[PDB]
Write a protein that binds this ligand. Structure first.
Ligand SMILES: Nc1ncnc2c1ncn2[C@@H]1O[C@H](COP(=O)(O)OP(=O)(O)O)[C@@H](O)[C@H]1O
Ligand SMILES: Nc1ncnc2c1ncn2[C@@H]1O[C@H](COP(=O)(O)OP(=O)(O)O)[C@@H](O)[C@H]1O
Ligand SMILES: Nc1ncnc2c1ncn2[C@@H]1O[C@H](COP(=O)(O)OP(=O)(O)O)[C@@H](O)[C@H]1O
Ligand SMILES: Nc1ncnc2c1ncn2[C@@H]1O[C@H](COP(=O)(O)OP(=O)(O)O)[C@@H](O)[C@H]1O
Ligand SMILES: [Mg+2]
Ligand SMILES: [Mg+2]
Ligand SMILES: [Mg+2]
Ligand SMILES: [Mg+2]
Lengths: 349, 349, 349, 349
């Protein structure tokens, strides 16, 4: 047979991905130490493997460690703090999250003719800026996974001509909608793509030519580092200490429980910040419009399609609608548009 | 040895050039600053070198200033003005346009005893006026051009008796038709050449003598200063602001996009002004018919053929037909009539 | 700084060189003084500059010394001795011969700051011994060349980061077959490269690993000093005194003229030594294979392709076929095998 | 809008083409340089445009060359020598011939929003192997044609989903008889189709199923590369030189004239080679039957219809009948068997 293909996302909110065979996984970017589980196995059945990933990671050097990752690390109070996780792409913590989705997307008993073409990504301004460290790490990568409670290993090792990078959401509109939007693109019109993530937020536009082929705008597209969904979590934390006034702080779970709900269950009571929830949501999306028109002068008048994506874009649709109503819309998977955009435009390989 | 020859046109609509190979280049007269390009190479194509002219310029102090020019400069929001770009031929803006067309037309590794001829143009009412300023500038020219992201370079330095100054429209019908009009001309008549330039329209006529040689008449031929395609850009500019009723000013790109077609795209929908485009073209056509008859009394009634040139000569031909029907016609290259007219008449030396 | 590239050789029989632009020269390594060529100038057209290298050479103390070098010096009776030539890489001979092919391959129209990466060579066994002396010499190099009878000159000076030092036969099969022998190299084999030069004979092998990467074996690879084409010229010279039966002896030009053909025209008639030319070339070919197997035991069975290099192997290929038939083969440019190998593997910088 | 349909063929013998309107053209696959035809215009009236295709074809950079092509090229002594047409599918020989019939088969003044489906083919073994080689060449096809002496231009540029790819001889029976031979096809037999091409004769078989539908066999069907009418031109070329006994060689035009007649005229005489023409036609027909039954065991008895095609099939039908009498019939248009088969099966899209 031929060599296999995997597209995953290294997004700091939740690690996303979808393979060649349209199996997809998603889990928050939280890791923890792993400890052996037989007791809770007896009480509650682990029905979703992704729900309860306890994982061991092998190496030739014999430096294996058990890890709780994702949802199983989210229940941990001893997990990663996640509000200040470092953006070192070559870090050992990023090795845990990346090696997690590998065996999840590799089906059981693939032959040796199959070799995994990984397709991952960088931020837009960090694409050229942070290319070589991840190029070094994926060249460096040589491990073997071990699933606790499911008991099947995957030797994971990558040569060159098996790795592929693209910028964040590059093929999300260069592919995956580009056959669909051929009805809408006509002549010299900018289509708009916005990806609202946790740490960072990217807005990317493609100029089409007279020949109806898209071309990239590096001066009409940039990376909004420091503007993202993490600012809502940083605001709603400070609003909770404004609402509790004890000095008490939510943990890593209750903070991430808040900005989906707005009504935290604290001291047996619903400490409410519903007004401060919506105000922080109109805070962030308005701060995007200034950064949108910071790259968009009179050229906003030539737009024909505004698309938004990202998990933040799911919960800021009407908040970010005021860029251009009756034109802005929502992509089918706001979160998975990076990975499928890495998939379909990765199907050049 | 002999010296290689490149003919270029410094017309303000678009810069047009050709060398001894008959290799021809053409690009608009729009410049912008040079910005680093590594990201856009990963997205789209570079192979259209005319489309992507990022270019280093070494100066007499040999200090780099990068520039965008033409189509790459046209997509910039901070490009040159181009609607009131300076008419000074000694401008550093013109230093960008002059060296750029040379770099695409100097072949790789010419012989060392071969040097460079250049044949340029001046406006017909400005050739006596603006002769020695460009004669100073062409002799002062010592620069080194470096194509960014195509990566080949030329050190270009001229001396005296290498440059050649003719008026604009001098050799377009002196040469370039002399081998073809010999079956056309009869005796003691005039031929018609009207070069519809962008800012100024050039009108030139030749008397043929008894020996069937073109002799020039400066009293029946002059420059239409201020009359040209730049009036159509000014006319349809008001036509879009009056149709939008918003103060909606087009940029440099949309304005050239408008008067090419008349169907501008504006905020999700088209603003169609195809009707007023005919009215602006009938205006400029009438602006040439009446100014022709000032130079042409009943001496017009002794013509054999009328050719028209310029890029604006291409778009007017149906409404500029009514100067003289069944005698007016179009030259074979309305854009390249100047530079090829500079070329063969530059081969007199 | 788009720095230029020129790859040269220091071959005793002749100098082989090529630039970045794949312009290549070849000329014998024979020097003489320079004398005023104006008399022959009116007689015969001095057209081939490579045939007619009368060259003016300055130094740091501006001491101009004209030299006949190459083909014209070979025509001179008072030439370089060249069959007992000193092997000092820092010789004035090598100062001229290295500076010879520089200006013959330094192109026209170079930028002001742009330097040239020079790639050179050493004998393989002496690459440890003589690394300092050429690095002493290339750092020393500060001169100015000038070309008599072709009316152009070049500046010539280099520093470090422009120098590049790979041995003879190193990059010839490392690169230049790199993506072509990759389909031939499979697992745990050796590839054979033998340079049959004039004075020296090189043997170099490369173990390819499991990972399809060549690795070097210094103990299956050696420089056979004292074996080469210089034996055949010295053998047939005494044979010329034999078959002439008079004690008469050739000159240095007839020395290289003989064993290219074997039928020297002497005293109004040919002198036939064609039998001994077949004898000596088979005799040297016997001495190559035996000393090849001096480094090659049963590891000759671990070969998959043998290539030969140098000017001698081109005319020895029928008699050098006996190493391993249909596994041994001839490289396409037997002279320029080191040169292009110096080129692309010298293009790492 | 609605898109037109033109079916062409890239046959090395002669180009065969038809449109949606059944207006069909045929001309030999020979090109030559073009020269100014006005002297012959006055003597003989140019009526047949296909006889007299002098043509000039622009690129997208205003480079174009004069070309005689076809019968007009067969009158030229320095034309495409027709034994050495370029086997690269992206050759300029292919480029001019492809645009030739497309200039001839697009009627005048079609709407610009109405495109044209082009339907092509490849030899059967070379179809999938060279599919993307043609697929990029069809997308690269961007030209503008100009006919000398008839003076009507066509703009010619098509992308993907404007093209159509089915092999040589595939749709010849998969359409145009597949909905007509249903009285003859019953169950589990094989229909026979042999396209006798110039270079390559194709053998293709369709099995019919239980459900009275054709299914393809690839082990009973093959391309005979090097078997075709090109053997006869090569054979009789020796036969003329063996009968002349002088070394007098026929030209390209006398070659094709020979193996249509067998009686060339030569220096006041007919050099009779009719017997050698009998020798070639029985030999080639025997060679086709042998390679047919190489692919065919006792499944030759499982036949019900044997059709043949090609221009060679037009001139070998008696000798090629001897596979099976009363079953070896001839198709309607032996040249245009691919053409209408490309047309009607191209009407599926
Ligand atoms: N149902 C939801 N309710 C509230 N917030 C959500 C929801 N789904 C996703 N999010 C937010 O979106 C973020 C996920 O963004 P994502 O598309 O993964 O971007 P990145 O690639 O930067 O991780 C999460 O941090 C979360 O706060
Ligand atoms: N296809 C076209 N459609 C509309 N306008 C055109 C077209 N081609 C050229 N032009 C017009 O012609 C002008 C080019 O004139 P040109 O011959 O370059 O004269 P100049 O020497 O004054 O620059 C442009 O400014 C443009 O408006
Ligand atoms: N056509 C030829 N006929 C005979 N000998 C040749 C021919 N071409 C090259 N040679 C021999 O090859 C030698 C050139 O070897 P070369 O590859 O330059 O090695 P080196 O690097 O040691 O100089 C010359 O001395 C010459 O004797
Ligand atoms: N009337 C004819 N007489 C002799 N040969 C012919 C005649 N018509 C066609 N042919 C032969 O048939 C060939 C044409 O084959 P064709 O069907 O075009 O196949 P291809 O697709 O390979 O070009 C010509 O080369 C020619 O030799
Ligand atoms: Mg993201
Ligand atoms: Mg002009
Ligand atoms: Mg050597
Ligand atoms: Mg055919």
């Amino acid at each position: 047979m031929n060599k296999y293909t995997i597209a995953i996302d290294l997004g700091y909110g939740q690690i996303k991905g979808i393979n060649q065979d349209n199996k997809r996984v998603i889990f928050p970017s939280i890791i923890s130490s792993g400890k052996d589980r037989s007791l809770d196995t007896f009480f509650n059945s682990i029905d979703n493997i992704v729900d309860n990933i306890h994982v061991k990671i092998l190496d030739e050097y014999f430096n294996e460690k058990e890890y709780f990752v994702g949802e199983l690390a989210k229940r941990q109070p001893s997990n990663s703090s996640f509000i200040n996780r470092d953006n070192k792409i070559n870090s050992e913590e990023n090795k845990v999250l990346l090696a997690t989705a590998l065996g999840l997307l590799i089906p059981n008993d693939l032959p040796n003719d199959t070799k995994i073409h990984i397709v991952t990504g960088l931020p837009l301004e960090h694409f050229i800026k942070q290319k070589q460290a991840l190029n070094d790490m994926l060249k460096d990568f040589e491990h073997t996974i071990k699933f606790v409670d499911h008991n099947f290993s995957r030797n994971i090792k990558f040569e060159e001509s098996n790795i592929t990078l693209f910028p964040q959401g590059a093929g999300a509109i260069f592919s995956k909608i580009n056959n669909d939007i051929s009805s809408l693109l006509i002549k010299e019109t900018f289509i708009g793509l916005i990806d609202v993530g946790f740490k960072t937020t990217d807005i990317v536009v493609f100029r089409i030519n007279k020949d109806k082929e898209p071309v990239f705008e590096q001066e009409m597209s940039a990376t909004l580092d420091g503007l993202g969904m993490i600012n809502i979590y940083n605001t709603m934390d400070k609003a909770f200490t404004d609402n509790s006034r004890d000095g008490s702080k939510l943990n890593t779970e209750q903070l991430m429980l808040l900005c989906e709900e707005g009504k935290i269950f604290f001291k047996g009571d619903y400490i409410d910040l519903k007004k401060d929830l919506i105000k922080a949501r109109k805070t962030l999306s308005t701060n995007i419009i200034n950064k949108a028109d910071g790259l968009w002068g009179s050229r906003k008048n030539s737009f024909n399609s505004i698309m938004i994506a990202g998990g933040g874009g799911k919960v800021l649709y009407n908040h970010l609608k005021l860029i251009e109503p009756n034109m802005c819309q929502l992509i089918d998977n706001p979160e998975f548009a990076n990975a499928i955009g890495y998939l379909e435009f990765g199907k050049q390989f």
